[PDB]
Amino acid sequence: NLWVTVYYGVPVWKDAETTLFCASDAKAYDTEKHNVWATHACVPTDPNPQEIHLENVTEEFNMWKNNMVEQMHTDIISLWDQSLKPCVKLTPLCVTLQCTNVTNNITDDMRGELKNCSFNMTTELRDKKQKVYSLFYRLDVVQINNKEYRLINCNTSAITQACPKVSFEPIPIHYCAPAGFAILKCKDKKFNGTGPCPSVSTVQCTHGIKPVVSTQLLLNGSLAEEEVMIRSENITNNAKNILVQFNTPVQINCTRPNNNTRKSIRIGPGQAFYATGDIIGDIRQAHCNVSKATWNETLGKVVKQLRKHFGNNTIIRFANSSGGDLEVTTHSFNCGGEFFYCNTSGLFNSTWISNTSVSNDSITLPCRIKQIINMWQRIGQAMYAPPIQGVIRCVSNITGLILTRDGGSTNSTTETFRPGGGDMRDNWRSELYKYKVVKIEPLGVAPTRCKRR
Amino acid sequence: SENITNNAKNILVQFNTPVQINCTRPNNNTRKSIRIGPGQAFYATGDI
Amino acid sequence: VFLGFLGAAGSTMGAASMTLTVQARNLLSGNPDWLPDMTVWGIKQLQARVLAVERYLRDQQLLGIWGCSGKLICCTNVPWNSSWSNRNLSEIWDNMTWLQWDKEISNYTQIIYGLLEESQNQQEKNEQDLLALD
Amino acid sequence: VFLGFLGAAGSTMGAASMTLTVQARNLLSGNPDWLPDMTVWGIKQLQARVLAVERYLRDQQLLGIWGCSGKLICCTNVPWNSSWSNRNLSEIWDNMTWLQWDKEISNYTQIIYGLLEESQNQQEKNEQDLLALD
Amino acid sequence: VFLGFLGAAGSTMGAASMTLTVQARNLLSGNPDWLPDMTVWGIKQLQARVLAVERYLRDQQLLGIWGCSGKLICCTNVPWNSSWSNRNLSEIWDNMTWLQWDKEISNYTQIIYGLLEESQNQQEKNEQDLLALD
Ligand SMILES: *[C@@H]1O[C@H](CO)[C@@H](O[C@@H]2O[C@H](CO)[C@@H](O)[C@H](O)[C@H]2NC(C)=O)[C@H](O)[C@H]1NC(C)=O
Ligand SMILES: *[C@@H]1O[C@H](CO)[C@@H](O)[C@H](O)[C@H]1NC(C)=O
Ligand SMILES: *[C@@H]1O[C@H](CO)[C@@H](O)[C@H](O)[C@H]1NC(C)=O
Ligand SMILES: *[C@@H]1O[C@H](CO)[C@@H](O)[C@H](O)[C@H]1NC(C)=O
Ligand SMILES: *[C@@H]1O[C@H](CO)[C@@H](O)[C@H](O)[C@H]1NC(C)=O
Ligand SMILES: *[C@@H]1O[C@H](CO)[C@@H](O)[C@H](O)[C@H]1NC(C)=O
Ligand SMILES: *[C@@H]1O[C@H](CO)[C@@H](O)[C@H](O)[C@H]1NC(C)=O
Ligand SMILES: *[C@@H]1O[C@H](CO)[C@@H](O)[C@H](O)[C@H]1NC(C)=O
Ligand SMILES: *[C@@H]1O[C@H](CO)[C@@H](O)[C@H](O)[C@H]1NC(C)=O
Ligand SMILES: *[C@@H]1O[C@H](CO)[C@@H](O)[C@H](O)[C@H]1NC(C)=O
Ligand SMILES: *[C@@H]1O[C@H](CO)[C@@H](O)[C@H](O)[C@H]1NC(C)=O
Ligand SMILES: *[C@@H]1O[C@H](CO)[C@@H](O)[C@H](O)[C@H]1NC(C)=O
Ligand SMILES: *[C@@H]1O[C@H](CO)[C@@H](O)[C@H](O)[C@H]1NC(C)=O
Ligand SMILES: *[C@@H]1O[C@H](CO)[C@@H](O)[C@H](O)[C@H]1NC(C)=O
Ligand SMILES: *[C@@H]1O[C@H](CO)[C@@H](O)[C@H](O)[C@H]1NC(C)=O
Ligand SMILES: *[C@@H]1O[C@H](CO)[C@@H](O)[C@H](O)[C@H]1NC(C)=O
Ligand SMILES: *[C@@H]1O[C@H](CO)[C@@H](O)[C@H](O)[C@H]1NC(C)=O
């Protein structure tokens, strides 16, 4: 009465993990920065993003078991490694540096930590050697015991200088799906992160994502939809991080005010080292301003979404960081080339009543600067940031948060959400939560009435 | 053998029963990790 | 109705059969142009789009060893078994998706390929050879 | 007459149709043997001969989605449109090259593929399914 | 009887013809998964399994240019030549292996491909075009 029949090209997908592509955004030829982040290899963007909504399709997404985040993490790591491979190495810089405090410690109650170091470096030739100076900045040893000093970067790993021609400005990079596979994108405004998406669309290329390395605060991220989102792999477990996505962007303006200069001292037959020159003009610490009204409103909007998980008409608190690594306890990011480590101790001093909290036009945050970074998971290499000639001012949208809850028997009392971070993957789950990779299996069978021969 | 008549060509022998061998370095040795360069670290044979 | 690529993933199997070329044409050619010569990053995506065509050719070998061969709809001579999805007609093609269909068949799907590769061309070809001489 | 590979590029389309296998056999297998293992120079030519087979498989998918499927000469059921090259027979096959032909068709060539992929198998297959039960 | 892959290498050609799908299914998919990204060792095996599919596609082009096209048993219209293996029927299919067969044909095998590619589709297609108008 009825026989089996094959059908090729049926809408059947199975969730799997494979290698993805990457987009060139199409403005790469007009940037002409020689090499940005992924301007190296990615292909230009299609003229029309094929975004096709699939009606009557509900698909179970799980952002915490996703494999796109691992792909993007390994890609960023290999990006760092292949960008720093052909640049200038600075292994002869690990010498002894007789340093001196800056000539302006006016009012020693306030801090001033830049060391006018001088040292005998190797020159163009190998026979002679020349004495240079001006390494500066806080990161250094306290010497073994004009005071002697050396580099703790040398106490850890080898050092290489970042190429001065390349840039660190994040270009919009959106991953694309290869042949045979597709990317399901959730579309409803409120998404639990783990669960069935009722409004699903399909694409090959995703939406533009800027690779930003940041802690405690997500910068230049994608805004949420109408509501602030509180995502977590397991809200009961304290050890698991708490990701927060904002509805309205928080304005932040960071400034390195030191109208700085550079010195190109020649070392080796081809290499050339860029040293931080003398500070022309007055000196003061780098900082970051955030409008106090916007931050107040953002906190008052996030607390109500947190009360949905931890009780109505209850109090929550959040102090500053606990302690540990400098990259974990401080909002660390990059701007213009200089790496800012700011302390958010001035933003998290709050207790919340059921209706209010317990002028000042803006809140300023001090910020130290670091040029040598051991953020690489390969503890065999470290990068020297080349000095930026001039004043630095960079604006940004704050869009997310990473929080950790204090464990213990704090049920009857209140809960604390101290800032944290560390894992780079948490920075990517705020952008790839709505995306899942699926493979197409177009071979189906079904019974119909027909006969051959 | 590739050619048993030719002397220069080696002669391979495969056993039926395995011959037990026990090799020992008895020097209860130690190591020293001396740091060299900014990242490298050389492992030297310590005192016996 | 088209509704583009995978538009009928939640529609009936009959309505989904109206868009076979749509799902077929976008799986094989997701062509990336790899003219820039970048060292370690090309091998991963190259392995990806090579395993893609390997899987595609595995599917094509499976669709060639059977009596079916046209990359389209096709009928066979293997009877449907009442043990596999005890359902009548129009109950399948008008209240079921291909996802749930493959889910219910997944328990008995593995023997159907064998019944299509052996009970057909291992005997249909031999009958074709012994019935083409007259 | 053979005249080898591409020998009839300037001859008539009818005479050029006599050498289809000649142009077909030399495009797919320009086989280079890459047994030597040389680092950065292999990826470029490997990408080249992989994009070659990708383009070949794109052409094969286009020639499979149509009612035509044999890698040979083939006839369809889509009528020729008088708007496309207002010319009679023997005027095309005896005083025209395939180059100038594709040049004149290039203005209207893009819709012919759609008329061959949709007006045919999106209806010919469905008619085959609804006329094979009796 | 199956006897697995290449089981009938020393059996008769008739018994060996009973296991064509067995030798066909294990040559194309010896799939290695190359998810680990290892530098200089991947290019060699990648070249290997790419030349594998290149040879496979050469064989498929040879089996497509002929009147045969189904990846199965098939008959042609080129007569067997008495100069090629002066043997009767049942003498070949019941006391000979495919190895010795190809060995005896290797002296005259090179012209058979030409007789199959030219004496067939270079005339069979043209007869099909000039006999399909009525
Ligand atoms: C960050 O910088 C921007 C631009 O410098 C500031 O925006 C300005 O705000 C002032 C005061 O409200 C206005 O008078 C200007 O017209 C604004 N300019 C632009 C271009 O928008 C912003 O206020 C700064 N934010 C903080 C927290 O300092
Ligand atoms: C001067 O340098 C010494 C170096 O040991 C440091 O301890 C001290 O705090 C510095 N004083 C300043 C910066 O006023
Ligand atoms: C520098 O720091 C020292 C303390 O180490 C302090 O006594 C001195 O006043 C500061 N300023 C100058 C100009 O030395
Ligand atoms: C740093 O010391 C050098 C001497 O090596 C001197 O020429 C230079 O002016 C000093 N800079 C400052 C800011 O004190
Ligand atoms: C979201 O998913 C988690 C998974 O554990 C579940 O417990 C929770 O009820 C879901 N909904 C909300 C609003 O969190
Ligand atoms: C920074 O210093 C240089 C050198 O004194 C000066 O020419 C320049 O104008 C300064 N920057 C600004 C923004 O004025
Ligand atoms: C946090 O604030 C306290 C003072 O309230 C301060 O002593 C501490 O250094 C700050 N930072 C950390 C990481 O605790
Ligand atoms: C922040 O909002 C609270 C609640 O209205 C208010 O008490 C406090 O004064 C605000 N802080 C400002 C305006 O700096
Ligand atoms: C974010 O975007 C702004 C554009 O205003 C840019 O200046 C900045 O470098 C970007 N990155 C960060 C970390 O702020
Ligand atoms: C911040 O968000 C506003 C709101 O859409 C947008 O206009 C602006 O370009 C954003 N800036 C950055 C640096 O993302
Ligand atoms: C080797 O020497 C160490 C140090 O004296 C000792 O602790 C250890 O027990 C010795 N090895 C054995 C097998 O006893
Ligand atoms: C259906 O399958 C069962 C077990 O798989 C088998 O015993 C039976 O003979 C099959 N019937 C048909 C008609 O295929
Ligand atoms: C579709 O509806 C029929 C009758 O209402 C029911 O028997 C059948 O199980 C339904 N299909 C599915 C997949 O549940
Ligand atoms: C020919 O093409 C024109 C426009 O492309 C169209 O209006 C007309 O119906 C077509 N006629 C045929 C017979 O295909
Ligand atoms: C071939 O000749 C005919 C008549 O001489 C003419 O109408 C036609 O246009 C010619 N072909 C071309 C391509 O010019
Ligand atoms: C057989 O081959 C010979 C030489 O190859 C040729 O002369 C003869 O015509 C052929 N006969 C047939 C029937 O093919
Ligand atoms: C098989 O046997 C026949 C008759 O015994 C003989 O003529 C023929 O040559 C044999 N086959 C082979 C390949 O020797």
TrEMBL record, chain B:
Residue positions the entry lists as glycosylated: 3, 16, 22, 28
Protein localization: Host cell membrane; Host endosome membrane; Virion membrane
UniProt modification remark: Highly glycosylated by host. The high number of glycan on the protein is reffered to as 'glycan shield' because it contributes to hide protein sequence from adaptive immune system.
Free-text comment on this protein's domains from its UniProt entry: The CD4-binding region is targeted by the antibody b12.
More details: HIV-1 lineages are divided in three main groups, M (for Major), O (for Outlier), and N (for New, or Non-M, Non-O). The vast majority of strains found worldwide belong to the group M. Group O seems to be endemic to and largely confined to Cameroon and neighboring countries in West Central Africa, where these viruses represent a small minority of HIV-1 strains. The group N is represented by a limited number of isolates from Cameroonian persons. The group M is further subdivided in 9 clades or subtypes (A to D, F to H, J and K).
Family: Belongs to the HIV-1 env protein family.
Function: Envelope glycoprotein gp160: Oligomerizes in the host endoplasmic reticulum into predominantly trimers. In a second time, gp160 transits in the host Golgi, where glycosylation is completed. The precursor is then proteolytically cleaved in the trans-Golgi and thereby activated by cellular furin or furin-like proteases to produce gp120 and gp41. Transmembrane protein gp41: Acts as a class I viral fusion protein. Under the current model, the protein has at least 3 conformational states: pre-fusion native state, pre-hairpin intermediate state, and post-fusion hairpin state. During fusion of viral and target intracellular membranes, the coiled coil regions (heptad repeats) assume a trimer-of-hairpins structure, positioning the fusion peptide in close proximity to the C-terminal region of the ectodomain. The formation of this structure appears to drive apposition and subsequent fusion of viral and target cell membranes.
Quaternary structure and partners: The mature envelope protein (Env) consists of a homotrimer of non-covalently associated gp120-gp41 heterodimers. The resulting complex protrudes from the virus surface as a spike. There seems to be as few as 10 spikes on the average virion. Surface protein gp120 interacts with host CD4, CCR5 and CXCR4. Gp120 also interacts with the C-type lectins CD209/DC-SIGN and CLEC4M/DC-SIGNR (collectively referred to as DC-SIGN(R)). Gp120 and gp41 interact with GalCer.
Protein name from the UniProt record: Envelope glycoprotein gp160
Span covered, complete protein: 273 to 320 of 860
Automatic annotation (TrEMBL), chains C, D, E:
Highest taxon, organism lineage: Viruses
Compartment annotation: Virion membrane; Host cell membrane; Host endosome membrane
Immunosuppression: region residues: 44-62
Segments of this protein annotated with the region Fusion peptide: 1-15
Residue pairs linked by disulfide bridges in the UniProt entry: 68-74
Membrane-topology descriptor: Single-pass type I membrane protein
Coiled coil: 103-134
Carbohydrate attachment residues: 81, 88, 95, 107
Record-given protein name: Transmembrane protein gp41
Shown residues in whole-protein numbering: 517 to 663 of 862
